[PDB]
Design a protein around this ligand. Structure first.
Ligand code: NA
Length: 232
């Protein structure tokens, strides 16, 4: 629950991926400050050069660090499932191109929040925007729409990621997401709401490996009951 996130929490991220047969691994380390909604992470492709653009992996590479307003805390499924954790699965459909399917487990190893991911990508075009590395190294702001999934005792989400392309166009990546708690502990199943996300991608000038430095800010919104400063 909430008590596990009141301070700064170390994060580890591990990703094993296969896109069109290209096998790669990514490791990340950093920390999260859920009280402010802030993540700071650095990711390295430990197998060598990454075969897809780093921005395509941002959403896959810990929504338990979202800042939920006080009046919305009872709608925070992600923290409610901690420390035992949750499974997060997605299908990501790149318009006019291939698809990623991802399965991750997000849980605590003691003080550290760990996101361990398997990713499979298929049907990508060899000189599409992904395998052709035509996406700009930057990231837009989005809304993540959450609803409860009673049957699976978890949540579903949907959203559309917009990836800038180097020729000025936009590459859409449609996200379908399901989260299921690990084990049988009680959880908070929320009313419909959304996350508001913002991200900054950068590079470490002293890092020669293929890598991504990430700053991310996420808050929850879409419910107003109990937010008394809004009465005025
Ligand atoms: Na919360």
């Amino acid at each position: 629950g909430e008590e596990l996130f009141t301070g700064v929490v170390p994060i580890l991220v591990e990703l094993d991926g296969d896109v069109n047969g290209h096998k790669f691994s990514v490791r990340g380390e950093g920390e999260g400050d859920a009280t402010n909604g802030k993540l700071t992470l650095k990711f390295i492709c430990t197998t060598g050069k990454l075969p897809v653009p780093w921005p395509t992996l941002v959403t896959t590479l810990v929504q338990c660090f979202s800042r939920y307003p006080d009046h919305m805390k009872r709608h925070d499924f992600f923290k409610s499932a901690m420390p035992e954790g949750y499974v997060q699965e997605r299908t990501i459909s790149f318009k006019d191109d291939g698809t990623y399917k991802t399965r991750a487990e997000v849980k605590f190893e003691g003080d550290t929040l760990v996101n361990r991911i398997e990713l499979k990508g298929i049907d990508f075009k060899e000189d599409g925007n992904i395998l052709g590395h035509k996406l700009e190294y930057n990231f837009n702001s989005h809304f993540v729409y959450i609803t409860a999934d009673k049957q699976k005792n978890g949540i579903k989400a949907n959203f559309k990621i917009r990836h800038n392309v180097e020729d000025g166009s936009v590459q859409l990546a449609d996200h379908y997401q399901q989260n299921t708690p690990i084990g049988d502990g009680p959880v908070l199943l929320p009313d419909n709401h959304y996350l508001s996300t913002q991200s900054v991608l950068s590079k470490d000038p002293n890092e020669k490996r293929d890598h991504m430095v990430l700053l991310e800010f996420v808050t929850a919104a879409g419910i107003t009951h109990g937010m008394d400063e809004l009465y005025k």
